[PDB]
Amino acid sequence: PTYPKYLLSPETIEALRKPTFDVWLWEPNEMLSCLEHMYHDLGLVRDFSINPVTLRRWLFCVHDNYRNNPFHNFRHCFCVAQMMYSMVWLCSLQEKFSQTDILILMTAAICHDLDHPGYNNTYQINARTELAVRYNDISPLENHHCAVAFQILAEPECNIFSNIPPDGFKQIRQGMITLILATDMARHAEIMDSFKEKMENFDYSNEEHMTLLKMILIKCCDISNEVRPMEVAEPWVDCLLEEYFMQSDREKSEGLPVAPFMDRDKVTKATAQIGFIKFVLIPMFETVTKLFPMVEEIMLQPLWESRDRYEELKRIDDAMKELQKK
Amino acid sequence: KYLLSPETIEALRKPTFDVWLWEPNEMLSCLEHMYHDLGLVRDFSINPVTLRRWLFCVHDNYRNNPFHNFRHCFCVAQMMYSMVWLCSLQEKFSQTDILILMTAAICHDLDHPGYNNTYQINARTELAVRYNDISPLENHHCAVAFQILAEPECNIFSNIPPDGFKQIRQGMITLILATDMARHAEIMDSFKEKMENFDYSNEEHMTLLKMILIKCCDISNEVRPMEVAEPWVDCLLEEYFMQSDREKSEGLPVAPFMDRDKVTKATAQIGFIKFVLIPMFETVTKLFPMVEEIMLQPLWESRDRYEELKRIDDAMKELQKK
Numbered sequence A: 001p002t003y004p005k006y007l008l009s010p011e012t013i014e015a016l017r018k019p020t021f022d023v024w025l026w027e028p029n030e031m032l033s034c035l036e037h038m039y040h041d042l043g044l045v046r047d048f049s050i051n052p053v054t055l056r057r058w059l060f061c062v063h064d065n066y067r068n069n070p071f072h073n074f075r076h077c078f079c080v081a082q083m084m085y086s087m088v089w090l091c092s093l094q095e096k097f098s099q100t101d102i103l104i105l106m107t108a109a110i111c112h113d114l115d116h117p118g119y120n121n122t123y124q125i126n127a128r129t130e131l132a133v134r135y136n137d138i139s140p141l142e143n144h145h146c147a148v149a150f151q152i153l154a155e156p157e158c159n160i161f162s163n164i165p166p167d168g169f170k171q172i173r174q175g176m177i178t179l180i181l182a183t184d185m186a187r188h189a190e191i192m193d194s195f196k197e198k199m200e201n202f203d204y205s206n207e208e209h210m211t212l213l214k215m216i217l218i219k220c221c222d223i224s225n226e227v228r229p230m231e232v233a234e235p236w237v238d239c240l241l242e243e244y245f246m247q248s249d250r251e252k253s254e255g256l257p258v259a260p261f262m263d264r265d266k267v268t269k270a271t272a273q274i275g276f277i278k279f280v281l282i283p284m285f286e287t288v289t290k291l292f293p294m295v296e297e298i299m300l301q302p303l304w305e306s307r308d309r310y311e312e313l314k315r316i317d318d319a320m321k322e323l324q325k326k
Numbered sequence B: 001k002y003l004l005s006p007e008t009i010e011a012l013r014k015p016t017f018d019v020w021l022w023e024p025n026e027m028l029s030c031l032e033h034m035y036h037d038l039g040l041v042r043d044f045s046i047n048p049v050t051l052r053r054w055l056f057c058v059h060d061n062y063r064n065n066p067f068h069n070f071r072h073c074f075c076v077a078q079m080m081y082s083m084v085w086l087c088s089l090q091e092k093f094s095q096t097d098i099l100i101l102m103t104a105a106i107c108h109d110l111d112h113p114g115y116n117n118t119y120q121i122n123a124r125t126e127l128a129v130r131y132n133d134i135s136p137l138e139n140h141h142c143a144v145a146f147q148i149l150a151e152p153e154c155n156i157f158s159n160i161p162p163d164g165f166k167q168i169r170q171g172m173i174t175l176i177l178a179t180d181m182a183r184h185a186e187i188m189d190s191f192k193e194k195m196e197n198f199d200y201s202n203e204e205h206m207t208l209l210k211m212i213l214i215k216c217c218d219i220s221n222e223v224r225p226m227e228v229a230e231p232w233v234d235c236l237l238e239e240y241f242m243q244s245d246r247e248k249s250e251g252l253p254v255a256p257f258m259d260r261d262k263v264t265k266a267t268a269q270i271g272f273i274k275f276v277l278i279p280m281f282e283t284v285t286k287l288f289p290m291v292e293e294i295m296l297q298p299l300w301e302s303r304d305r306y307e308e309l310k311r312i313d314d315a316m317k318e319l320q321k322k
């Protein structure tokens, strides 16, 4: 017969390994089975004795604790984890990383934005929210994401780590914390600098070198929308702006400082992306490409195409503006 | 009784102050006096009644642990006060820096549960989860401090412009977080590096001096006269033994240094005085030479007395082993 949607066709299983995967085609259950497959496929179920039913329940519980924000939602969480999965195969990460490290990368990726409220750290801090007060202005959102993740894992029925010895739990916990806290974009430049410092003489057996590489990998996945095919990447920009304009409107309304790059009166889809692609995304992937040359063809190539395309779109937007006064 | 005598006011400036004489209300008045006396009420337009309410609210949020209680909070604040005079800190620090120092000292152990970070993390408590194993207690004390200040009746900063608030908040966070002893060696290394060529106009140098200053006050019990210092040790052990009992009882790791079967009053202090307190105050003394005689002196005397007490403990134990 034809099988229900939550049983994945072998074609889907093959495509899920690539960054070309159309993340929009699927509904929550399907995305959940994809994530489930990822954990069996990467050998994590086997190597950490994860009860398969607990795995399913953990995923449903993770899903429940993402909110319906325009951008920072379950689908984002899915993109980040799916990109991480793609890079595991693209860069043959199982040759460089222990299975515990793969578990840290994957789990951190899935958990990195739990219960995101849809307003960034600058808002939390400027408006003196309960979160800012609780975290003393220190990466409040990312601390919260990480706490929710471990609240979830402390419910015994959601605890995928239940059969891991306490030495492994401690190593995994600290790994996930580092990685989730590393996604706070306030720290982008710091982390990139530390990473570039090690890249002068990179050493795969050096634990500090690897920690940074993992921090860079999760960061790559977190903001990797523009790496994806044009058709898959574009709607994410509408989602981004919808969520961010919601914040700046509120900042205006409550008399809080407003950042030009998020002002709904000043921003186009093009100006949102160009600078970000040229000066944040491209340099980051260029550096990763030095360790993993195969990344150039698969991830810098589409970033270049997207830069050029949005640069052209701006020339056109500007010419059109000029024309209404010229 | 309610009102402080001029002798009390005078004694409050010195580290000889007998912290045990006073009950909570009289300690609150002493803390009140410090804020007026330092010019903080004047220079920040603190509403005088809000100041009293704030202190009462702070008081309400300290717990009745044997050691980490409102009286410890008083000792730290009062030792800070003493150092402002001893080291003439109003010449070197802005009034904002003094306010940060005093307010952080008062707030630095708010709502302490009586079991340290190692317990929080190993037991996987609510606080360790909330703060991801990163100085959970000290983040929590800080959080509580600003929840208190968000209540408008307790807000001693209500007449400070936003920018000043932000600066005070940042300073307070750094100092309360610096009290975590897991960071002792890191902070000492950083400070000793700056003492290679210290600069009162470098903000990073001043930030570390304040971190060192609050640390000094936090752990300063042994600097006080013996009659005042000794009872704090019983409190210390009472509280730390309560933890280690619970740790044995729950299958969690127990540290020899706080094991009720292994620890005498003397073995608790000798190492701490010799390797934590003396070297820290030695470094501070290089900036403030008057510290040597007022604070390193009672420390040397304390070290020597506990070393004697240990020799006599070891002798009475030779009358026991079977």
Ligand SMILES: C[C@H](Nc1nc2c(cnn2C2CCCC2)c(=O)[nH]1)c1ccc(Cl)cc1
Residues within 6 Å of the ligand: A185, A222, A223, A224, A225, A226, A240, A241, A244, A245, A261, A262, A263, A267, A271, A272, A273, A276
């Ligand atoms: C500069 C930034 N552009 C951008 N930001 C992105 C992307 C993905 N994640 N992020 C940000 C959301 C948190 C990690 C940075 C992306 O593809 N583009 C931006 C421009 C305009 C607005 Cl309205 C919002 C963000």
Ligand SMILES: C[C@H](Nc1nc2c(cnn2C2CCCC2)c(=O)[nH]1)c1ccc(Cl)cc1
Residues within 6 Å of the ligand: B181, B218, B219, B220, B221, B222, B236, B237, B240, B241, B257, B258, B259, B263, B267, B268, B269, B272
């Ligand atoms: C080594 C430590 N000694 C010690 N620790 C002290 C003192 C003051 N504060 N503290 C600690 C309380 C947390 C900031 C350090 C003190 O006077 N002595 C200690 C030994 C045995 C037990 Cl049971 C507890 C503590």
Ligand SMILES: [Mg+2]
Residues within 6 Å of the ligand: A112, A113, A183, A184
């Ligand atoms: Mg995030």
Ligand SMILES: [Mg+2]
Residues within 6 Å of the ligand: B108, B109, B179, B180
């Ligand atoms: Mg403390």
Ligand SMILES: [Zn+2]
Residues within 6 Å of the ligand: A076, A080, A112, A113, A183, A222
């Ligand atoms: Zn994200």
Ligand SMILES: [Zn+2]
Residues within 6 Å of the ligand: B072, B076, B108, B109, B179, B218
């Ligand atoms: Zn303390």
